[model samples]
Target: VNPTVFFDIAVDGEPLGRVSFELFADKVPKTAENFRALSTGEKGFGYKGSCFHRIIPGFMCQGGDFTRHNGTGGKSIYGEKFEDENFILKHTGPGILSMANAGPNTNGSQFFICTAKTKWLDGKHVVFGKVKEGMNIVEAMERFGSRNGKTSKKITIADCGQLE
Candidate 1:
């Protein structure tokens, strides 16, 4: 079975509820494992308390910088960063969960959810998961996006874990 995970979000510092995701470990184990471990805090570090540092309304909502909390710092449980597992999955539609990297093969703990069909990222970003619930919460977050990047409001991942 696909390992399901969730992030309890707080938009503008208030609870907005949970966003659950169904990870595609069967397709990309390494990529999914990185995200799953980051959500679980199994390695003593994870996505909890980190906020969506970048939100582009027509594009995506980004987060998982557990260290810097901006868009700069966050690492895989394996190390500071990890290589791209594969690009078997495509950014075909919205709510597509994928990794955020500095460049090719520089994936870390940072991730984002596509708010629209982002075809340009198809072959680059490793798509390892998809939104299983709470698309409305993501929709509610769109108004906070800026023309460039960064956010008008800080949406924190107040809590996160595998669905046990």
Candidate 2:
């Protein structure tokens, strides 16, 4: 069975909350695997210490550009960009986890967690997972986010791994 993965988020280095995800492994195995591996720190790479580089209230909170801690850097565990899974999963509502890309077939390690439903994003990004808990923390992130989409103070991933 695909293990449950969790990401613990923080604000200004303070404990914020933890969010769990249910991976769409069957439909987006590659994308899900990449996220899972990165989240678990497998092979010396992980999301720990990464910050939310982009945020938009009532829209999404984007991060996972672990390489630069900014939106400009990140790559899949494969060490290169990969094709979009374009899985049937849709951006239906808050806390959906989707891959971030510049354009078609440009998926990498960058990703975003929707803080609110964003139907317009459908077909633009690939959805790989959905929040299973702690969405309240995500809502708080949106409330406190800045205009440029960066956090007022840096937010970090304190921990992330399989739940059980």
Candidate 3:
């Protein structure tokens, strides 16, 4: 069976909802493993309490920077960034989960959930997972995005882990 994971989010302590993702571990093994590790706090770091530091409506909602809370910090559970999968997976629609990096092969704990078809991001970011459920909540998160964005309302990943 394919690996599945769930991520629950909240805004300022309000339970937004949970999003289920079918991880492309078979395709992007290392990248999927990194996200699975980070989401579960497996290697001592998780996405819990991490804010959606950068949000752009009609684009993507970027988060998973558990270290800095801003966009500038966060690394893999391995304590260093890893190489990119750069697989053939396309970022063709909303609710696509991908690694957030400064450039190539700089992937770490940071991630983003696309809220629209961000074709420009195709081949640039590694698409490791796709949202399988609860996109309404993901859409709710999209409203938080702004050109000059810094949310006082914290976007918290209350929990994230693999599922049966």
Which regions in candidate 3 have their CA more than 4 angstroms from the true location? none
Tell me the spans in candidate 2 whose CA falls farther than 4 Å from its real position.
none
Put down candidate 3 lDDT per residue, 23-102, tens digits, no spaces: 89888888888887777777777886778888888888888888888888898866668888765788889989898888
Question: Candidate 2 at 156: error in angstroms?
Answer: 0.9
- RMSD (Cα, Å) of candidate 3? 1.3
**Over the full model, what C-alpha lDDT does candidate 1 score relative to the true structure?**
0.90
**Using Cα atoms with residue i matched to residue i, what is each candidate's TM-score against the true structure?**
0.97, 0.95, 0.94
lDDT of all predictions: 0.90, 0.86, 0.83
Query: Any idea what lDDT model 2 has?
Result: 0.86
Best by TM-score: 1
Q: What does candidate 3 score on TM?
A: 0.94
- 58-142 in candidate 1: lDDT tens per residue? 9999988989988779989889888888889999888999999879989999999999999999888999999999988888887
